[PDB]
Amino acid sequence: MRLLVTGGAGFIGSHFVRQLLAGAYPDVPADEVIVLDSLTYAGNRANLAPVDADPRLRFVHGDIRDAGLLARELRGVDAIVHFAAESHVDRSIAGASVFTETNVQGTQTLLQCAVDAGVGRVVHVSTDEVYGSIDSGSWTESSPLEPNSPYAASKAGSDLVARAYHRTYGLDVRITRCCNNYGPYQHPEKLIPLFVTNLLDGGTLPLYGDGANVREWVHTDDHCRGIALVLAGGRAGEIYHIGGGLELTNRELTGILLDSLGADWSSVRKVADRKGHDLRYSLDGGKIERELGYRPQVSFADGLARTVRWYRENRGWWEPLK
């Protein structure tokens, strides 16, 4: 019952850690949790402050690319949940190399070390962006990889590395793919926290192009619960989509955020569109539901409300990040 969580000081990773330690995943027993995080601009020790008193938690400031470190930290580890990654599309367009480096090479290093340490199973956390764009309908686990951005191409490359580790060495690795997450502790470079915090700072909102692009949104709590279900009961080598997604154009979402804050359209500015911007993401989550029983439980309206309030009450957390 010794687990290692990479990227556990980031947004999603920290939520998984806080929840696991809170006992929200009865089927994943945690006797000892090691968090490995290199603390890039996106990692934040404060995301784990609510649990730093936990005796079961060991925090390791280090890199997934460090084979030396992993060979030692993975001794006796039964399972790994891998969240560590460069995760922002805009950064990837501005400076792609670090995406290959952390995402593809880091994943290769981590999995090789897992094989050398005899780790039981690994959950590789991935994204819907690997599928490109979809005008109508939703993608299934058999949809083809047609990444458009360097970030998406790096995440797809890392999913291929996972497949090879399972096929060649017999590593029990499971892959999850999810839509856009939202919730407390999300870095303010991401759409929702960026727009909410700009508003709180009395600023404008940079809406790309026309705002017609479509994304599906899931509360990170639901995403993390699906990851725990896969950890506990998925099958080696399988891919699972974690749905939930309420589908919105960015325009309509912008409107919901303005309302949630008492603001108006005059706060929005239309900016030049993102290079190669994906028009629409939509994931079909029937497989995980039929196989593992997963269904989202946080409605957008409630989740979003709690999220906005969190930002309103935590300027001390986000201010420094901007």
Ligand X SMILES: NC(=O)c1ccc[n+]([C@@H]2O[C@H](COP(=O)([O-])OP(=O)(O)OC[C@H]3O[C@@H](n4cnc5c(N)ncnc54)[C@H](O)[C@@H]3O)[C@@H](O)[C@H]2O)c1
Ligand Y SMILES: Cc1cn([C@H]2C[C@H](O)[C@@H](COP(=O)(O)OP(=O)(O)O)O2)c(=O)[nH]c1=O
89 binds ligand Y (CB under 6 A): yes
- Residue 260 interacts with which of ligand Y, a second copy, Cl ion, none, CB < 5 to 8 Å by class: none
With a CB cutoff of 8 Å and minimum separation 6, the contacts of 5 are: 13, 16, 17, 33, 34, 35, 36, 80, 81, 82, 83
- Residue 268 interacts with which of a second copy, ligand X, ligand Y, none, CB < 5 to 8 Å by class: none
140 binds a second copy (CB under 8 A): no
The region of 29-37, 154-162, 203-211, 294-302 touching ligand Y under the rule CB under 6 A is 203-211
Which 170-209 positions form the footprint of ligand X (CB under 6 A)? 178, 180-181, 187
7 binds ligand X (CB under 6 A): yes
Give the DSSP per-residue string, 169-237: H---EEEEEE-EEE-TT--TTSHHHHHHHHHHTT--EEEETTS--EEEEEEHHHHHHHHHHHHHH--TT
Asked about 302 being catalytic, the answer comes back as no
Catalytic residue among 151, 165, 281, 294: 151
With a CB cutoff of 8 Å and minimum separation 6, the contacts of 95 are: none
38 binds ligand X (CB under 6 A): yes
For the bound state, the minimum distance from the C-beta of residue 140 to Cl ion, rounded and expressed in Å, comes to 12
Instruction: Please work out, in degrees rounded to the nearest 5, the angle formed at the alpha carbon of residue 235 by the alpha carbons of 158 and 56.
Output: 80
Give the DSSP per-residue string, 305-321: HHHHHHHHH-HHHHGGG
| Tokens standing for residue 79 | 């399972």
Q: Are 277 and 132 in contact (CB under 8 A)?
A: no
The region of 162-170, 189-197, 256-264, 303-311 touching ligand Y under the rule CB under 6 A is 189-197
For the bound state, the minimum distance from the C-beta of residue 168 to ligand Y, rounded and expressed in Å, comes to 12
Query: Is 160 annotated as ligand-binding?
Result: no
The region of 70-78, 100-108, 118-126, 186-194 touching a second copy under the rule CB under 8 A is 100-108
Look up residue 197 and give its amino acid: T
Catalytic residue among 66, 73, 86, 129: 129
145 binds Cl ion (CB under 5 A): yes
Asked about 151 being catalytic, the answer comes back as yes
Query: Is 18 annotated as ligand-binding?
Result: no
Query: Is 155 annotated as ligand-binding?
Result: yes
190 binds ligand Y (CB under 6 A): yes
* Long-range CB pairs of 197-201, under 8 A, 24+ apart, other chains included: 197/311, 197/318, 197/322, 198/267, 199/257, 199/258, 199/261, 199/263, 199/267, 200/261, 200/311, 200/312, 200/315, 201/322
Count the site residues for a second copy by CB under 8 A. 33
- Rounded Cα distance between 83 and 126, Å, is 8
Question: 61 vs 269, which CB is nearer to ligand X?
Answer: 61
Active site residue ranges: 128-129, 151
Residues in binding site: 11-12, 37, 40, 63-64, 83, 85, 87, 102, 151, 155, 180-181, 190-191, 206, 208, 215, 250, 274
Contacting positions for ligand Y (CB under 6 A): 89-90, 180, 190-191, 194, 206-208, 213, 215, 250, 274
